[PDB]
Amino acid sequence: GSMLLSMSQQVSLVATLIANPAKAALAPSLGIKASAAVNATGLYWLADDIACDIPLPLGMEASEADASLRATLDGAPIDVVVQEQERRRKKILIADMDSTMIGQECIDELAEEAGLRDHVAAITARAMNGEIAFEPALRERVALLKGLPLSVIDKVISTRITLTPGGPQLVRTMRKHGAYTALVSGGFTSFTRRIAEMIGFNEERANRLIDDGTRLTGTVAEPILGREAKVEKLVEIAERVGLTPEDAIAVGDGANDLGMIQLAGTGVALHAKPAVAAQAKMRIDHGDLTALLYIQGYRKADFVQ
Ligand SMILES: [Cl-]
Ligand SMILES: [Cl-]
Ligand SMILES: [Mg+2]
């Protein structure tokens, strides 16, 4: 009950090392080596060979620990995050869909059905990197879908969309612990409704393709939801659940996710290209979506299996 200890708990940092479970290279010896590299108070395994917490000695800047740990692990596929230990477990998740919760870009997959995958995918890549603004890029790409029959959506969904590893476990585990989870996308409601329910999200919010009753018109419902719409949705969710954006973890891979990534108390650039990852305070380049559970301090024993 010491106030001296209690204040120390607030300025207390912890580093977390995280591997992909499919390339689980965080060996016990490596974790000890890393913890010695930062004069750690301790070393706590969240998942054998996959993730460990390394409490940092008080007074060490987070930037120092990050450099030290990345040096010790250089050349190993192990991610590094540093944060305050208090309030690392969040009660809101907000997650992008395309190339984040799913392996594909829904717009590029639909473009294949128009014989224009490569053309559209090149635009998608520049939009994801920040070289073109999202809304005009979305309009340009969707215009090339004009005339596709509505049956093509379920075809794409059923046959070409796959869930990113760790996604259901991430969503279901935070829900087990009382968190509210939302799938937000610059993509399309016809995809996010199905994906959200496969994974287990509480809600979804995305753009909407316009149709004439049988075929796509090649346009999107006005107004188009982009970077600010993701920020506004995080604000809306937090107010509605009686919290603030500091109580949320946000994750995405693209330039238009950086608003919600930067507003959230924990913002994660997941497998992002360098220009996007440079603008997030946390990056996961190797782990899968279970990395976000380890970020929050969950042990594998806490997971919904
Ligand atoms: Cl639940
Ligand atoms: Cl739609
Ligand atoms: Mg994305």
Local structure of 242: helix, strand or coil: coil
In a domain, 283, yes or no: yes
Q: Is residue 131 part of a domain?
A: yes
How many domains does the structure of the chain reveal? 1
Q: Which two tokens stand for residue 34?
A: 């890393």
End-to-end CA gap in the chain: 36
Inside any domain, residue 6:
no
Q: Which of 53, 98, 108, 288 is catalytic?
A: 98
Active site residue 118: no
Quoted resolution (Å): 1.9
96 among annotated binding-site residues: yes
Distance 98 CA to ligand 3 centre (A): 4
Whether residue 4 is contained in a domain is answered as: no
DSSP 6-24: HHHHHS-EEEEEEEBTTB-
Tell me if residue 288 is catalytic: no
| Residue 193 maps to a domain | yes
Residues whose Cβ atom is located within 5 A of ion ligand 2 = 188-190, 208-209
Cβ distance 99 to 287 under 8 Å? no
Domain holding 214, by residue range, is: 11-305
CA 97, CA 206: separation in Å to the nearest integer? 9
In contact, 218 and 143? CB cutoff 8 Å? yes
Which helix (DSSP H) or strand (DSSP E) does residue 106 occupy? helix 106-113
In a domain, 3, yes or no: no
Q: Are 128 and 273 within 8 A, CB to CB?
A: yes
Three-class SS of residue 113? Answer: helix
Catalytic residue of the set 79, 96, 108, 247: 96
Instruction: Give the helix/strand (H/E) hosting 184.
Output: strand 180-188
d(CA 201, CA 192): 10
Residue 5 domain flag: no
CA 84, 89, 93, 95 dihedral sign is positive
Q: Which of 254, 263, 298, 256 is nearest to 281 (CA)?
A: 263
**Percentage helix, strand, coil for the chain under 3-state DSSP, each rounded to 5:** 45, 25, 35
Answer yes or no: is 76 within a domain.
yes
